[PDB]
Ligand binder design. Structure first.
Ligand SMILES: N[C@@H](Cn1c2c(c(=O)[nH]c1=O)CSC2)C(=O)O
Ligand SMILES: N[C@@H](Cn1c2c(c(=O)[nH]c1=O)CSC2)C(=O)O
Ligand SMILES: [Cl-]
Ligand SMILES: [Cl-]
Lengths: 262, 262
């Protein structure tokens, strides 16, 4: 069985995957840039395969519909054989681990609070005790699911708040959440994964801040279909890249080396 | 094939596994206490197996002799079938991943610097540039191997320093390293995993401090023999315990709830 080009599924999400400014002049994988573009190339180099970057059709990370039992997002593309590997800020979770294979984490993170500078909030407990400062999450993904499924008193109270708050505290994209923080004069706080919070804190106009400790401790993993032979090699590649210091260099490149906030 | 009692290998290392003060009055698993004792019980409860805690014979975590190609430590006990699972502060590394299976991490950590309070050191770079303040690691394990194998200029210089420094800067146990920091009047700094550094910082006589950022970003994993059926279940149990908040509660219990330094 001859080797085939590996189909990678990913998602447009700065700074992980972005279309280059001059992408119309380019073709194939060269149209894209970012942390996960660089990571894909490093993994392919170490493992010795050719690959094609593709963008997940439905714009989702991965969840199972309770009624149809169908998996959507990048997880679904792996489950149904439409892609060979997912390389994205994809959180390792129990229900996802049951249906796909994950590498050991290439990045550690946790849920965190983004505020407009000057907002009198220091913690999740602070948020949970009040309603003047509205707060919410993406309307899809592991951050929302954290609150929806939590049995911890503070986070379950926060979820009950989010479901019943008006106007809706949910956002469709990271950009919408960040924009809402920036335009709401301190009256909206955004719950999001800490590494995204850190990235935005170093972007103009430098008006946001990460506050408080993380609410949990999770990781992003490279995902493959359950039992795929590619899985073992890619996991070893992640560990090698981490042990060589290259993952730390990649985060510095896309987060801090060109930070815009001094 | 009837079920059998699961043989767990672990290692005496505070606060992960300790013999209880009254252990002579007790028997079996009840002789022991600590973070990994509690974790083993939680994993066994979720997975529905009985188990026996045993202490690794050679007191090592796991490495392969370059000449004989024999694996020692807890990794060796798994490789050669002497134990079914290792539950310990065992770092997930590439060479270990090649021969045993690892769960996703139950704890995140990195190499860090422990100083006696008042030592004029803030970073690994600070240490690397001088010799008046001696510095070293355990004489076995992943922290030592980090320096021995590093191709990063600062850490390779530190390793060349450690090999050639007199008297020997290596220690046999965590307790020896901590004691050496405490007795050396600021002239010894100890390189060790960050969660151990954090634990000791909250122990009397409250004379040590963790300084600087971590040098790397790694995780501890539950280990099983390659291909063991127990591996999948235990990995799902780790993810469940993390998602329920129980791993965070376990760290707080053994690190901070009874911290001795205010
Ligand atoms: N990592 C999440 C998706 N996701 C992401 C971000 C966030 O803040 N929350 C969230 O749930 C910033 S990049 C992706 C998942 O795998 O579902
Ligand atoms: N986790 C290491 C062993 N190990 C440990 C500690 C440390 O500081 N360095 C180190 O290498 C404090 S508990 C165990 C390993 O798996 O080899
Ligand atoms: Cl092809
Ligand atoms: Cl038995």
């Amino acid at each position: 069985g001859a080797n085939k080009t590996v189909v990678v599924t990913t998602i447009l999400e700065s700074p992980y995957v972005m279309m280059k400014k001059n992408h119309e002049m380019l073709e194939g994988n060269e149209r894209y840039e970012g942390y996960c573009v660089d990571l894909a190339a490093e993994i392919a180099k170490h493992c010795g395969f050719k690959y094609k970057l593709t963008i997940v059709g439905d714009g989702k990370y991965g969840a199972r519909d309770a009624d149809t039992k169908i998996w959507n997002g990048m997880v679904g593309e792996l489950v149904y054989g439409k892609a060979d590997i997912a390389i994205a800020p994809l959180t390792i979770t129990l229900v996802r681990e049951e249906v796909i294979d994950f590498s050991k984490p290439f990045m550690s993170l946790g849920i965190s609070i983004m505020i407009k500078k000057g907002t009198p909030i220091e913690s999740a407990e602070d948020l949970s005790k009040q309603t003047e400062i509205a707060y919410g999450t993406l309307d899809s993904g592991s951050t929302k699911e954290f609150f929806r499924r939590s049995k911890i008193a503070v986070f379950d109270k926060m979820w009950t708040y989010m479901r019943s708050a008006e106007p809706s505290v949910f956002v469709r994209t990271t950009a919408e959440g960040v924009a809402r923080v920036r335009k709401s004069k301190g009256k909206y706080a955004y719950l999001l994964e800490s590494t995204m919070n850190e990235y935005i804190e170093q972007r103009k106009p430098c008006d946001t801040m990460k506050v408080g400790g993380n609410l949990d401790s999770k990781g992003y993993g490279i995902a493959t279909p359950k039992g795929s032979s590619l899985g073992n090699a890619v996991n070893l590649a992640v560990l090698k890249l981490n042990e060589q210091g290259l993952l730390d260099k990649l985060k510095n490149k896309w987060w801090y080396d060109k930070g815009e906030c001094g």
